[PDB]
Amino acid sequence: KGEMNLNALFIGDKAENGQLYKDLLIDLVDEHLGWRQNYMPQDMPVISSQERTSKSYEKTVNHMKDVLNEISSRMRTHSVPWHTAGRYWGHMNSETLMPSLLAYNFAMLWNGNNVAYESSPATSQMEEEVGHEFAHLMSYKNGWGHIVADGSLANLEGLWYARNIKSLPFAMKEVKPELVAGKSDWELLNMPTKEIMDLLESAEDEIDEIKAHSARSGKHLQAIGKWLVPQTKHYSWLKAADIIGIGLDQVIPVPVDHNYRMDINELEKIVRGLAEEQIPVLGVVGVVGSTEEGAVDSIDKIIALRDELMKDGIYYYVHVDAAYGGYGRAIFLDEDNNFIPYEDLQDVHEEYGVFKEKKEHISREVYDAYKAIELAESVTIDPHKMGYIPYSAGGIVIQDIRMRDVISYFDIPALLGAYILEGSKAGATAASVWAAHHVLPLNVAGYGKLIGASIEGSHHFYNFLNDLTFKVGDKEIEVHTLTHPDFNMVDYVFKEKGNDDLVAMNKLNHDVYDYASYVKGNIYNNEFITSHTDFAIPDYGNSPLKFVNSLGFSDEEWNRAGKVTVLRAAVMTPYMNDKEEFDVYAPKIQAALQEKLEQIYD
Amino acid sequence: KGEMNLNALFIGDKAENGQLYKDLLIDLVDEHLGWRQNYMPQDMPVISSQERTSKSYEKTVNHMKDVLNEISSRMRTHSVPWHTAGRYWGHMNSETLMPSLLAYNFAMLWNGNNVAYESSPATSQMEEEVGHEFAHLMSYKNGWGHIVADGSLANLEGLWYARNIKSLPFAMKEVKPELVAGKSDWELLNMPTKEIMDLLESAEDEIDEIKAHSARSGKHLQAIGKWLVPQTKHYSWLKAADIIGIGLDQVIPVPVDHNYRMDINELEKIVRGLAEEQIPVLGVVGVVGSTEEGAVDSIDKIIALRDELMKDGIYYYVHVDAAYGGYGRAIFLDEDNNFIPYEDLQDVHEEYGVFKEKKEHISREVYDAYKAIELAESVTIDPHKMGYIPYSAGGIVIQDIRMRDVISYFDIPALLGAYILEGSKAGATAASVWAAHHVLPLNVAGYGKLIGASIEGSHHFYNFLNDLTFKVGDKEIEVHTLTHPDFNMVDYVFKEKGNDDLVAMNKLNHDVYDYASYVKGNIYNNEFITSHTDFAIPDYGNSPLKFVNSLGFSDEEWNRAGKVTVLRAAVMTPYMNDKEEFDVYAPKIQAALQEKLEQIYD
């Protein structure tokens, strides 16, 4: 429809569109109450007119008012103001899409459970569409998807899929050896996922028994392999191994590079060596959007490697943790859902308003990674992150809908609970995601413009911080950024011009956070709020060494400190894409930081 | 505060309190927008006055209106009208508490994540209170609890707790044998949960290593035991075994009686025999509130047995699945949180308005079961069920807060995600439960009156159906109820006076449902809606035999049909507690059923 103002799809940092929200909220509530009054309209109201004027009613209503007044006080005292544009530079949390908030409230009035079509048939159809929409976002042909409570529970379901998938070859031999005839025990534990599926889908009257001898029985859980994850992974993955059964001991950290993306060379070493040891890879986890750095792993090279190892009879499952950057793929899809060629990206992004300045914003290495998500088997995608959908809304997407039969217990499912890890779920959550996917198409005409604004605002902050020098009473403090953002997270540190004590930078940056957080002061009066993370050698290795040395520290001071405290800003605000609007909040950030540093040292 | 009208704590079956809802909704939204405008009030609105009058804005707003209009159409076409009182007699779904709906919407405007205190400190304190409130509901002293996305995910976390708990004895010997010195391998796999906890809490500088050798490593998952569940259990438990690692093969169905409650004698047989086989019980699952019958298992006798077997060195973990009836315990607690003596129940329930007619409504056998929930280790409680809190809100409660350290990864937790199975969670979900727990105390002064009304309305329907005879063209059809409700679910069947074909009753009852559902007709025009369930011998055994024979069928016709189709009504409406209000909807149900049966046969 030509052009779409994102400035109307949010309530606003200063409640600029608060009447629009309130008016559409009331219009929707009024439509639900009309539905209610006109279901069995011959029935007269059970709550009488005199009951609603009684003292019993007034005392109950006044008590509700007192409880809601206490919720209001606590929420307006101890809550964080990330709705503001150029003052919040911290965690992956900004404003949520008004269409989604309006739709959750509307559907919550029906209280539908999506575990069963019978409970809410309309919210259930919406969830199936949302999964078919998640598949077409990931270019998965004949794929599927479902909303998960959170992204940690979706990462778990991924391991559930793979755990049960690698267990199927061995089980097939134990129930219908005919399917896996002439196959070495090790050729079974290195069978491609497509073949395992094609075989199972062939044995119609045997799928149940093959699955009864699968990992669902509890056997072969240590034999299916070792889960390979980036070392800078999320604890959801550690927890996933513990719960699924493989155990934390069958998790191997794959080292990351100085851009904090998995070292594909090192992955090759780990995989090839474990295969010489005849131990399989249950699977490798690729991360698009790192928890602390916004780093996009080279899914392109992870999948390229898989192909090269298949010639040597080694296959691994690939699950993409795109909890953060999954919605980010929309910046690469046209209105016909085709991946835009890179040579045309900058031109298409000017035609659609994704980016306001015609320059490179996305590296071909991140483009190539986002593209190869279609060759992976499963993806964790979190609407409650860069989908700007309200919590709790996570998501999983599978490359082949048939895969759901490896998790299946017993067309739109009539019992989604028999195709998912969780049980009872809100259909309001589905209406929230469907509304957002329908106001904002999962392409360059909708979510692309929103993610583009997040990225362009991250780049303006990056360029602002890379020239920031202060002056705190004969103490010049310079700001230094960690790496060029692969998405929209800009990490940064503060340093005294001539302090070669990393423990002193790690204390400067800890003190900047302390002031830029609830730790010190009232959060309703903080002029700049940011996030903090420690990069410790136990988990990050010497991946930050290049950075620490660039700032003038030694490899011994690094091993002495044991870590670097980095400040993190996931720029999810969609208001700082315009350099002009950023240049208003620029002096407001510098002035705030000066005072903050001036309180730290005096 | 004397007396509390529940008729003001709901929007209404005919939107009687829709202005109150809308007015408190707008008052709350207005309080949030004021908070937003007055955080950094020196900042001028980024969305300009002219932007909000532009055609770009109007076209975007009109598209949002069109999407929300499509959600409205689909939701008002294919949704179920359970808000009505005496016309919906089906699944555990009625109206949700207005205080909770108002509070979710208010807190959703802050979009707080409860996985971390830093994200929303106010919603996080509310969740800790809600868990301390769940513990005092279950009389757990020094206990704790947390909100789970759903009850299936809470049942999983229970198995996570027990799986890791039984694994601790063996692991203790492998890291600090000193703690479990002089203990047989089998005395370790039959150690009481308190001792395992007291031992682990003693080895301060070793807990991490003991846990690293626990089931979290992936070892000893088949050695920890067999999970014992009622045969009429929920598939969440089957799924839980598959995911946790023990596997579906280590799940033993314990047979139920003709009241569809676990046969404690049969449990004794299974437990004692498996102990002679030297195979441990990972744990036994007790169910308060059955999925299809509303049956309360004798936790009293399950725990009594545990004590008796401990003399023979056999201990089992007990997890209570009170997803449905957990909130039901409030009907037994005084304003000082003491369990009311049974001899006084009827008198206290008249003093508090829990029951309007002074008669027995709760059997001493259900009282005794609800009381012994305090001796169990963990309980699944679903606010999104009989807590009348909106979906998705489930819950877990642990008898000892220290138990969280067996699941712990790394005062109010500063990272609840390291004490729970899930990750990112809505703080709005917490504000919804906290609001309900604060308007309705978890005792006889709040939730007791609501659950009492649900139960008294279930009893009036039970007594109505037990004398219901029709007349469909020389075909007299009589209604027969399954069992006396243990909570608020009344199961029932329809039968032709002289049809001894159970397959014909199972078709009569299937046809009654077909008409009383979305299967046949428009659901906005259904005058009576009910639920259906098949009781098959594979899962229910000969537990329905007494019932089928009472209706005049033979033990051969039972084995021929293989099942009985039962109609189910979980009376969660709080409006039918008054016989006078029920007697209005009584003729409206009989008239509807007559027509329904008259369509089936002609």
Ligand SMILES: Cc1ncc(COP(=O)(O)O)c(CNN[C@@](C)(Cc2ccc(O)c(O)c2)C(=O)O)c1O
């Ligand atoms: C890269 C990555 N993958 C998966 C997940 C798990 O997702 P989910 O939270 O839905 O279960 C994550 C985790 N992301 N969540 C955060 C960023 C949440 C958070 C927000 C604000 C805070 O103040 C804190 O402390 C946490 C997390 O780190 O857990 C992920 O990053």
Ligand SMILES: Cc1ncc(COP(=O)(O)O)c(CNN[C@@](C)(Cc2ccc(O)c(O)c2)C(=O)O)c1O
């Ligand atoms: C006794 C019992 N225990 C645990 C659970 C799992 O709880 P959760 O749903 O929160 O994950 C259940 C399941 N209860 N859910 C229902 C009753 C849901 C449902 C409502 C309406 C419908 O039309 C259908 O089909 C299902 C279920 O049976 O799954 C439980 O009963």
